[PDB]
């Protein structure tokens, strides 16, 4: 078991360092970011820790396909606006190398994205407001793999 | 059950703007800030629709017993992923929530991202929850802690 983060075109240089200070909180094992439109030495800023996943871990791709090779199964996610929660994880993914799959602050993901996800994973949260910041949104179900 | 969310001297005006975003993400009821150092201004811009609970929801006191009158549990948070000694009688870990904040109004406090809280907050707390991460890196940005803690309950 193996889990691989994949974070498409992120906009937010704070959002790319909260990232990768969450991947060293819970020992996420490859980080990925497709087509970064955030400044990266500004993310560094917010990293703390998390510095030494954006200089030694973090692979950055120009496009969506090189991110998501060999691996066994992807989950895209989005919130409940735009289909698994996270009590489904622990069975899907057991013995399994696992990408899971972000989009962007402003759009989400493409529909390439997601017809190349297996499954599609929602956060349940205020229906009137279910949408979460990125970085948040990747705390969380870091959190619930963390628990596994 | 009742929730007030405690905010001990935030720094960051992210921090802040993101704490208040989840604030209505995951319908807290109550939302205190003690002593703010955040420009409350620059943290409405991370608010996204959180803008209107700073403006009008959240409360600000200048001091921590006045953030945390009038309710039955007080949950303070640390980062300290082995806690020894006296304190441990005060530990608990998520898996313990459900039970304790049953039919209560309880207050969840979170510390500075500089410093955390003092000995004597946690004095004044009742438990001392861990969120439980990387033994050897475990202390987790402010707000994601909070995002986190806010999930667990929103679960239950
Ligand atoms: N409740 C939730 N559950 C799952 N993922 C979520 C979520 N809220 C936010 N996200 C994640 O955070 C990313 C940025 S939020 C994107 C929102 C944008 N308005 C849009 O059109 O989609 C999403 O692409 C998803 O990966
Ligand atoms: N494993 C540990 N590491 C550090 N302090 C611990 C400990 N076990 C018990 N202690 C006690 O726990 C107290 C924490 S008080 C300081 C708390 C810190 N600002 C925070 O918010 O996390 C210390 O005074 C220390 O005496
Ligand atoms: N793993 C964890 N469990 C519980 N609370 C955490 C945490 N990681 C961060 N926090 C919360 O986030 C706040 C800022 S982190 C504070 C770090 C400070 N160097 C210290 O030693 O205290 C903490 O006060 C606490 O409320």
């Given at each position: 078991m193996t889990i691989r983060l994949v974070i498409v075109e992120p906009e937010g240089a704070y959002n790319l360092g909260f990232i990768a200070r969450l991947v060293k909180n819970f020992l996420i094992d490859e980080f990925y970011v497709v087509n970064?439109?955030?400044d990266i030495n500004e993310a560094i800023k917010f990293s703390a820790k998390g510095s030494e996943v954006i200089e030694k871990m973090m692979k950055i791709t120009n496009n969506f396909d090189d991110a998501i090779r060999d691996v066994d199964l992807k989950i895209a996610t989005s919130s409940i606006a735009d289909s698994i929660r996270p009590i489904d994880l622990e069975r899907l993914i057991k013995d399994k190398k696992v990408a899971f799959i972000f989009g962007r602050?402003?759009?989400?993901?493409?529909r390439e994205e997601i017809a190349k996800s297996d499954f599609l994973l929602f956060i349940p949260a205020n229906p009137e407001y279910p949408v979460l910041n990125l970085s948040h949104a990747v705390g969380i179900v870091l959190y619930e793999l963390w628990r596994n």
């Open positions: 970064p439109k955030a602050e402003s759009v989400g993901l493409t």
